[PDB]
Amino acid sequence: AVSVLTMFRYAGWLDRLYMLVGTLAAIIHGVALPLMMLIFGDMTDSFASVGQVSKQSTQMSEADKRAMFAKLEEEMTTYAYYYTGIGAGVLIVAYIQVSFWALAAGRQIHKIRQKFFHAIMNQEIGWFDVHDVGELNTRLTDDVSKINEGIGDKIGMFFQAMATFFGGFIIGFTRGWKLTLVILAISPVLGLSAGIWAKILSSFTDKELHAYAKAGAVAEEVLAAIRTVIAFGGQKKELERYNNNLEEAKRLGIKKAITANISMGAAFLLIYASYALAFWYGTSLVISKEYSIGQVLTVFFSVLIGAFSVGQASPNIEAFANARGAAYEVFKIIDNKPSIDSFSKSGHKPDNIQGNLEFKNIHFSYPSRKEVQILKGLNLKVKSGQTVALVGNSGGGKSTTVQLMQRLYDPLDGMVSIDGQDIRTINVRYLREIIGVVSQEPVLFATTIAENIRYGREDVTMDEIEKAVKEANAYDFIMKLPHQFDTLVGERGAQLSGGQKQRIAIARALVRNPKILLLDEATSALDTESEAVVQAALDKAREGRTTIVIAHRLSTVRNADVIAGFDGGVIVEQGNHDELMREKGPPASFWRILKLNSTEWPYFVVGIFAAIINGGLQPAFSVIFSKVVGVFTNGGPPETQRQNSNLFSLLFLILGIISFITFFLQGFTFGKAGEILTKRLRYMVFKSMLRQDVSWFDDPKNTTGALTTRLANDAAQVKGATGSRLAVIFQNIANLGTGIIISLIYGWQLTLLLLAIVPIIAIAGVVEMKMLSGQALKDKKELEGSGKIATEAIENFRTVVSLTREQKFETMYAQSLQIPYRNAMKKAHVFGITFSFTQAMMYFSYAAAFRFGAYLVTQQLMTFENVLLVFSAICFGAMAVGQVSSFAPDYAKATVSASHIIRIIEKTPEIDSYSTQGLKPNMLEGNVQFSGVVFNYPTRPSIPVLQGLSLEVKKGQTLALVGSSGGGKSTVVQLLERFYDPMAGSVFLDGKEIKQLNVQWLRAQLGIVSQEPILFDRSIAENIAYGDNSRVVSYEEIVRAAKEANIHQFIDSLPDKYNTRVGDKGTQLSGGQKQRIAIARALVRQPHILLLDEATSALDTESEKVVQEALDKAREGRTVIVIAHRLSTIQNADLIVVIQNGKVKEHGTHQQLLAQK
Ligand SMILES: C[C@@H]1NC(=O)c2csc(n2)[C@H](CSSc2ccc([N+](=O)[O-])cc2[N+](=O)[O-])NC(=O)c2csc(n2)[C@H](C)NC(=O)c2csc1n2
Ligand SMILES: *SC[C@@H]1NC(=O)c2csc(n2)[C@H](C)NC(=O)c2csc(n2)[C@H](C)NC(=O)c2csc1n2
């Protein structure tokens, strides 16, 4: 499913040169580093030779050396010159590499996009028929960008990294004959261990994901049917299950965090030591008088630098593979030679053709459904001047006879000839432009009428095409509203109705001036007044040329002289027409109060001191490194050299292991805090959802899947927001502060240069990142110019190919992408110049800083070891700054978004319910009055309902309030439970207003049942007990309620009734019997009033007969209000008081015919 060594065949010779020079520049840039390392090695060796000052006789005679210092400064001048030379060279070569590679990539993307659009716009219609619309355009938008990114930047950096790797190792094979073995023999063990660590991390992550999916799904379930959940008032009983399931996740997350942090600590341990090992073997070799300090430094620094570089190339290869796959698909679309081309200059030129259409053995089936043969052979001959009307169920399925006229499909063994010439020999474009097509629905574009008319044929004059449009129904639908010209009719700007779209489409068809016309569903389901005029246009078009008309409406059939239509594929001649039956008819977060949510200071205070002590490691490493170098440079080689070297190596590991245990403690506290905050925030958010009520849940802005993602992939954001954003900044600031102060202790002047060179590099990196991010943000805006035409073109391809206007869309796409082409070229140049800029300033600052340090050493004040200490400390601190930032969990990625969204939803107040300020009368008479109650949908206030409803309810009432649709009557029964609120109306119950009737105790007495008995995955016995849950929970009444519900006879299968739960649709109950289970739950509620809305969703049949049996037993037992849009249900209701929107009272059907049907 991939392709390689083919993605660049569409590049020109200049592009090949571009790529070659880019590769050469990348190779040079890669080779740059090892040479610099070797220079540094020999340069430090020269220091060690000169700066030894071992003999006091030289130190006293002739003003110390004062001449060896001259040789030293000459050597330093030469070294600094060669530094700046290689820095300028790296500048130039890196600029060349990045710029040429990215510009060649841009040219390739331009060519690929143009060819892709041209090919996809040229395929046969069946290709789109076996495919969809939006997915293709999404592919077009995404894969081109993926290919660009890859075969630009990633392949650009890959050769650079690989050349760096071979370079350092070659320096290794020159100066590190044994250093290489220890360094490369320690390499596999360290990398492998971190990998065993990555594998364990992945396993723990998968376990955590599986564990959270159990509970998250309990969650998705309680939400899906949240209306029932709030109706039965089981929030207090339900949050407990949510919490236990959540708990079987936070301990797993604690384990996962422990694993990740101990893995990081182990990686540090494997690096500090072994790095330690290298010094251990190198220093001993220097003691053996065969190697020097520079010899060790060059190989050690070089081999490692290269290994990093070679390891850095993995994401580049991943992007390359993605680009390979995407290129494979997009090329697969390309070169897909269709059966019809419509572009090749081939075929005979028919002229003065009458248009005698023919049909002989016409067999065809749609490629989407080849199983059903749409047409099974027809024999027919027609003559020009006699329009033919087809009558039947449809146009042979869907306008099939029309489809083969313009070669939109390919006939199978059937031959059609307009004038005795087969369509295959006739040129496709010429055949298209001589036949006019009328669409069933006239899709147009948001553009002015002028180009809509010009889409017909090659425009000769604006006035001429206007005169062509001067046919009837003009000057009113084209001049009154559209201001006589230049009005972008469509969804964007002065949207019109189809009555004018059909007329302008017919006007375009007349601009075609066809030999033959085709009419398809002129006014299919249009307004009955919009017709009777468009048909006049069709008739006057008929007077010009012969047409084939297919429509469901029979009005045109009388007008048509020849009526040759049938159904089922059996041809019926046009001898007579009377035989056929005549149918009658989001701000940011505080970052100070968010963390204040974590009131776990005993779990939190450990980290800050731990973070500082962790950041304190790196400058200590720099000090130890400087001391190791000074042991051989400013050393004591007469007396003792082994003692201090071995002591420094021991310091190397004790420091490594203390950093390891520091990371252990830091993880053990920070991951635990993050996981406990995860569970805390989630448990709150769940109860916040519960107190939000139906109002917010009915808001379409929030959906069930979106809210499940809200509970899923936003707590991890706060996890990083807690520790990472604080631990990282504390570590970085501690490192920088302690490095700065130790540099000040060991440096009074050079630190000024260090603090002057660091900020320019920092701001250069920041401006580079900001510029690339801004260009990426703009890329969407300029690429949307392509989409503004591509979306409409792909959507309306049927009409587009039905029209002759093909190349114009390609030209507009070419221009609207050519502007982004220049934009991308300039962006490429900016990216290249800024990358070369930052690299060049890095090298040049290295050179200048080291040269001025050398000058100050020649001043005999700060000796080399101090210079190396300060330089390495500052630069490694800055390098660690960004590196530590990367190890964080996407704080840079959107995170504060989910953070403050969670804050907002948690701070959300309860609009209604879940409060103690409720008055609960002990017993209720049930005297409800739904009189003068008016209220609408808060979520959709555009549609007002529930106007002027007057009702009276008493004990024994059987109000069968039934009305048309559901928008006017469902809310009536939906208001008894106060899911919504009455603001214009007033509701009285027991002489008391409902707004303070102890909402929980209110829902307690309501036996409401939803229309669809949606049920969650609780055990059947526990599911039945869920009725009166959060109330007294008791045994030996569930069986009593089940028996009273007359359900025991069927459910006695597996009579245990306790563990026979529905295991994710396992042991599925009958579709109509779930509502029976709902009835049983309502009965075990022991209400005083019951509300029913089940109606008959499925084919309940005999099961339905049993459910109104249950209903009538329930209503003769206790007062029940039945709501159902079924005539049989109300006829079953003996107490016939049907009221619909309050026009009538009591039994309407007896008083008037209205309620009956
Ligand atoms: C604990 C802290 N480390 C990190 O925060 C860290 C995380 S990722 C990484 N570093 C990279 C990938 S690792 S390179 C490497 C090099 C050599 C060996 N070995 O087994 O001899 C192992 C490894 N390794 O850990 O994969 N390191 C380099 O790019 C690299 C190449 S030269 C070099 N550093 C210089 C000489 N040393 C340090 O800067 C240094 C000393 S303390 C320290 N860093
Ligand atoms: S004193 C200026 C500079 N400091 C940086 O922090 C810096 C800017 S860009 C950068 N570091 C990249 C991320 N560096 C490396 O990838 C890297 C790993 S090892 C290494 N560089 C060599 C040994 N050191 C430098 O190149 C260096 C010296 S000064 C400096 N960077």
Residue tagged 């449009």 (tokens): 469
416/311 same-domain check: no
Asked if residues 1089 and 1005 have their Cβ atoms less than 8 Å apart, the reply is yes
921 located within any domain: no
1026 located within any domain: yes
Q: Please give the Cα distance from 219 to 265 (Å, whole number).
A: 36
Q: Relative to the alpha carbon of 735, which ligand is closest?
A: 1
Cβ neighbors of 227 (< 8 A, separation 6 or more) are: 694, 697, 979, 1010
Q: Please give the Cα distance from 567 to 581 (Å, whole number).
A: 12
1043/1079 same-domain check: yes
**Atom 27, ligand 2: residue with shortest CA distance:** 875
Asked if residues 349 and 434 have their Cβ atoms less than 8 Å apart, the reply is no
In degrees, rounded to 5, the angle at the alpha carbon of residue 577 between the alpha carbons of residues 575 and 581 is 140
**Best of 875, 886, 887 for a ligand 2 pocket test (most atoms within 8 Å of beta carbon):** 875
856/935 same-domain check: no
Instruction: Give the relative orientation of helices 807-858 and 750-795 as an angle to the nearest 10 degrees.
Output: 170
Does the C-beta of 620 come closer than 6 Å to ligand 1? no
CB atoms near residue 690 (< 10 Å)? 21
692 located within any domain: no
The string of DSSP codes covering 815-880 is: HHHHHHHHHHHHHHHHHHHHHHHHHHHHHHHHHHHHHHHHHHHHTTSS-HHHHHHHHHHHHHHHHH
1073/1138 same-domain check: yes
For the domain that residue 143 is a member of, what is the CATH number?
A: 1.20.1560.10
**If you measure from the C-alpha of residue 412 to the centroid of ligand 2, how many angstroms do you get, rounded to a whole number?**
69
**If you measure from the C-alpha of residue 878 to the centroid of ligand 2, how many angstroms do you get, rounded to a whole number?**
8
Q: Please give the Cα distance from 670 to 603 (Å, whole number).
A: 8
310/420 same-domain check: no
Q: Relative to the alpha carbon of 172, which ligand is closest?
A: 1
Mapped onto helix, strand or coil, the DSSP state of residue 375 is strand
**If you measure from the C-alpha of residue 86 to the centroid of ligand 1, how many angstroms do you get, rounded to a whole number?**
25
- Structure-solving method: cryo-EM
Tokens (6 digits) for 1100: 């309940």
User: In terms of Cα–Cα distance, which of 374, 372, 364, 356 is closest to 567?
Assistant: 374
Mapped onto helix, strand or coil, the DSSP state of residue 339 is coil
Amino acid at 1101: T
Tokens (6 digits) for 421: 């010439």
630 located within any domain: no
Q: Please give the Cα distance from 329 to 323 (Å, whole number).
A: 10
**Best of 842, 871, 872 for a ligand 2 pocket test (most atoms within 8 Å of beta carbon):** 842
Tokens (6 digits) for 926: 């049930």
Does the C-beta of 878 come closer than 6 Å to ligand 2? yes
4/110 same-domain check: yes
**If you measure from the C-alpha of residue 642 to the centroid of ligand 1, how many angstroms do you get, rounded to a whole number?**
26
**Best of 169, 304, 658 for a ligand 1 pocket test (most atoms within 8 Å of beta carbon):** 304
273 located within any domain: no
Asked if residues 910 and 693 have their Cβ atoms less than 8 Å apart, the reply is yes
136/29 same-domain check: yes
Does the C-beta of 732 come closer than 6 Å to ligand 1? no
381/439 same-domain check: yes
Q: Please give the Cα distance from 764 to 771 (Å, whole number).
A: 10
Q: Please give the Cα distance from 753 to 744 (Å, whole number).
A: 12
Local structure of residue 1 (DSSP, 8 states): -
Does the C-beta of 191 come closer than 6 Å to ligand 1? yes
322/381 same-domain check: no
Residue tagged 């009536």 (tokens): 972
**Atom 23, ligand 1: residue with shortest CA distance:** 271
**If you measure from the C-alpha of residue 271 to the centroid of ligand 1, how many angstroms do you get, rounded to a whole number?**
6
Q: Of 812, 835, 861, which one is at a domain's C-terminal end?
A: 861
User: In terms of Cα–Cα distance, which of 1119, 865, 881 is closest to 1005?
Assistant: 1119
Cβ neighbors of 599 (< 8 A, separation 6 or more) are: none
- Distances from the Cα of 777 to the Cα of 98, 781, 788, angstroms: 21, 7, 18
**Atom 29, ligand 2: residue with shortest CA distance:** 875
Residue 272 Cα: closest atom of ligand 1: 42
CB atoms near residue 479 (< 10 Å)? 13
673 located within any domain: no
Does the C-beta of 304 come closer than 6 Å to ligand 2? no
536 located within any domain: yes
Q: Of 519, 539, 563, which one is at a domain's C-terminal end?
A: 563
Does the C-beta of 184 come closer than 6 Å to ligand 1? no
Resolution in A for the shown PDB structure?
4.7
958/835 same-domain check: no
Q: What is the dihedral of CA 345, 347, 350, 356, to 10 degrees?
A: -130
Q: Relative to the alpha carbon of 871, which ligand is closest?
A: 2
**Atom 15, ligand 2: residue with shortest CA distance:** 879
For the domain that residue 525 is a member of, what is the CATH number?
A: 3.40.50.300
322/380 same-domain check: no
**If you measure from the C-alpha of residue 875 to the centroid of ligand 2, how many angstroms do you get, rounded to a whole number?**
7
When divided into structural domains, the chain yields a total of 3
Mapped onto helix, strand or coil, the DSSP state of residue 70 is helix
Q: Of 819, 842, 861, which one is at a domain's C-terminal end?
A: 861
**Best of 271, 280, 624, 660 for a ligand 1 pocket test (most atoms within 8 Å of beta carbon):** 271
Tokens (6 digits) for 954: 């008493």
Mapped onto helix, strand or coil, the DSSP state of residue 896 is helix
Asked if residues 44 and 865 have their Cβ atoms less than 8 Å apart, the reply is no
**Atom 1, ligand 1: residue with shortest CA distance:** 268
**Atom 5, ligand 2: residue with shortest CA distance:** 879
User: In terms of Cα–Cα distance, which of 803, 129, 799 is closest to 441?
Assistant: 799
What per-residue string of b and e applies to 249-282 under the rule 16 or more CB within 10 Å gives b?
A: bbebbbebbbbbbbbbbbbbbbebbbbbbbbbbb
**If you measure from the C-alpha of residue 873 to the centroid of ligand 1, how many angstroms do you get, rounded to a whole number?**
15
**Atom 21, ligand 1: residue with shortest CA distance:** 183
Does the C-beta of 769 come closer than 6 Å to ligand 2? no
Q: Please give the Cα distance from 774 to 901 (Å, whole number).
A: 25
Does the C-beta of 842 come closer than 6 Å to ligand 2? yes
Q: Please give the Cα distance from 450 to 462 (Å, whole number).
A: 8
3-state helix, strand, coil in the chain (%, to 5): 60, 5, 35
**If you measure from the C-alpha of residue 304 to the centroid of ligand 1, how many angstroms do you get, rounded to a whole number?**
7
Cβ neighbors of 484 (< 8 A, separation 6 or more) are: 478
Mapped onto helix, strand or coil, the DSSP state of residue 271 is helix
Local structure of residue 996 (DSSP, 8 states): G
The string of DSSP codes covering 545-561 is: SEEEEE-S-SHHHHH-S
Return the beta strands (E) in 937-1026 as ranges. Answer: 988-989, 992-993, 1006-1009
Residue 270 Cα: closest atom of ligand 1: 25
Cβ neighbors of 1143 (< 8 A, separation 6 or more) are: none
Q: Which contiguous run of DSSP H or E holds residue 722?
A: helix 715-745
Does the C-beta of 187 come closer than 6 Å to ligand 1? yes
**If you measure from the C-alpha of residue 880 to the centroid of ligand 2, how many angstroms do you get, rounded to a whole number?**
9
Asked if residues 676 and 600 have their Cβ atoms less than 8 Å apart, the reply is yes
**What residues form DSSP beta bridges with 516?**
435, 546
**If you measure from the C-alpha of residue 687 to the centroid of ligand 2, how many angstroms do you get, rounded to a whole number?**
50
63 located within any domain: yes
301/376 same-domain check: no
Q: Which domain holds residue 1059?
A: 928-1151
Write the burial class of residue 711 (CB in 10 Å: 0-12 exposed, 13-18 middle, 19+ buried). Answer: buried
